Design an enzyme around this catalytic site. Sequence first.
Site, PDB file in Angstrom:
ATOM      1  N   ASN A   1     -10.465  52.236 -27.689  1.00  0.00           N
ATOM      2  CA  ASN A   1     -10.046  51.476 -28.896  1.00  0.00           C
ATOM      3  C   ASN A   1      -9.591  52.476 -29.959  1.00  0.00           C
ATOM      4  O   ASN A   1      -9.651  53.695 -29.700  1.00  0.00           O
ATOM      5  CB  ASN A   1     -11.152  50.509 -29.332  1.00  0.00           C
ATOM      6  CG  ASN A   1     -10.639  49.363 -30.171  1.00  0.00           C
ATOM      7  OD1 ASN A   1      -9.468  49.336 -30.535  1.00  0.00           O
ATOM      8  ND2 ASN A   1     -11.504  48.426 -30.501  1.00  0.00           N
TER       9      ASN A   1
ATOM     10  N   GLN B   1      -7.333  53.578 -36.793  1.00  0.00           N
ATOM     11  CA  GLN B   1      -6.083  53.032 -37.340  1.00  0.00           C
ATOM     12  C   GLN B   1      -6.229  52.668 -38.834  1.00  0.00           C
ATOM     13  O   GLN B   1      -5.174  52.533 -39.486  1.00  0.00           O
ATOM     14  CB  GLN B   1      -5.607  51.864 -36.465  1.00  0.00           C
ATOM     15  CG  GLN B   1      -6.484  50.637 -36.525  1.00  0.00           C
ATOM     16  CD  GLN B   1      -5.935  49.630 -35.538  1.00  0.00           C
ATOM     17  OE1 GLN B   1      -6.154  49.695 -34.323  1.00  0.00           O
ATOM     18  NE2 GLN B   1      -5.243  48.654 -36.076  1.00  0.00           N
TER      19      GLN B   1
ATOM     20  N   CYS C   1      -2.338  49.348 -34.042  1.00  0.00           N
ATOM     21  CA  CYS C   1      -2.965  49.399 -32.686  1.00  0.00           C
ATOM     22  C   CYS C   1      -1.885  49.754 -31.641  1.00  0.00           C
ATOM     23  O   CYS C   1      -2.163  50.578 -30.758  1.00  0.00           O
ATOM     24  CB  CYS C   1      -3.676  48.081 -32.349  1.00  0.00           C
ATOM     25  SG  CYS C   1      -2.628  46.595 -32.393  1.00  0.00           S
TER      26      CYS C   1
ATOM     27  N   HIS D   1      -4.264  42.481 -29.832  1.00  0.00           N
ATOM     28  CA  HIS D   1      -4.717  43.879 -30.016  1.00  0.00           C
ATOM     29  C   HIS D   1      -4.192  44.741 -28.874  1.00  0.00           C
ATOM     30  O   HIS D   1      -4.081  44.248 -27.725  1.00  0.00           O
ATOM     31  CB  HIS D   1      -6.215  43.907 -30.118  1.00  0.00           C
ATOM     32  CG  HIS D   1      -6.785  45.225 -30.480  1.00  0.00           C
ATOM     33  ND1 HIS D   1      -6.099  46.176 -31.225  1.00  0.00           N
ATOM     34  CD2 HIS D   1      -7.972  45.773 -30.164  1.00  0.00           C
ATOM     35  CE1 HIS D   1      -6.886  47.224 -31.393  1.00  0.00           C
ATOM     36  NE2 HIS D   1      -8.039  47.004 -30.732  1.00  0.00           N
TER      37      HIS D   1
END
Length: 216
Positions: A183, A20, A26, A163
């Site tokens: 992630n 990102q 996110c 997140h």
Amino acid sequence: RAPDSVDYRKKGYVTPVKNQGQCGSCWAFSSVGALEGQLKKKTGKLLNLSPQNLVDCVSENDGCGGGYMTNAFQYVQKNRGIDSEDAYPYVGQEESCMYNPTGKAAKCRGYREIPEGNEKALKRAVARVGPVSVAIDASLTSFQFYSKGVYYDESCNSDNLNHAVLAVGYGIQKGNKHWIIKNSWGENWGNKGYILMARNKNNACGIANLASFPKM
């Protein structure tokens, strides 16, 4: 009863780990991850969808200043499409909306939420549906330095969701139940961009507090 372990990476439902950069996007990676799983499930094609399309165009979200996955799914439904990454490349800064119908790679027929705090429902949804968008407290340095094993920190705050990530499976590593978490901090972070997060440890890091998946 769902299987004891599920891993959507083994079935070809998950795209490579993204970065990102210096953008609070996110939510947009989480959202495209869940849309990418449903696209592969329904069409047999694995392709990168456009987080940038969501950052620039989800007016109910705050671009690089944060957002929610449900708002993103509702946008894709209302917009009648989302672009491929190839048609709408990631920049990692917020620009004016440049959605192009010609590069449309998926649609969305709405979304469903997991009952808040319910890791049993989240497990059943991962098994039945595919990768699920989830929100966590990723604020702890313990999270930022993760390397291996099943992450658990009693200081993790389930009321401090900050997140958005993607649950691409679940399992048990040497008796420790876990969620398999993709992630968006690059391949360099954690275990090649993944973290195993504690499962059935009282909703550790609020993993089941804001989970959703798109309809396709």
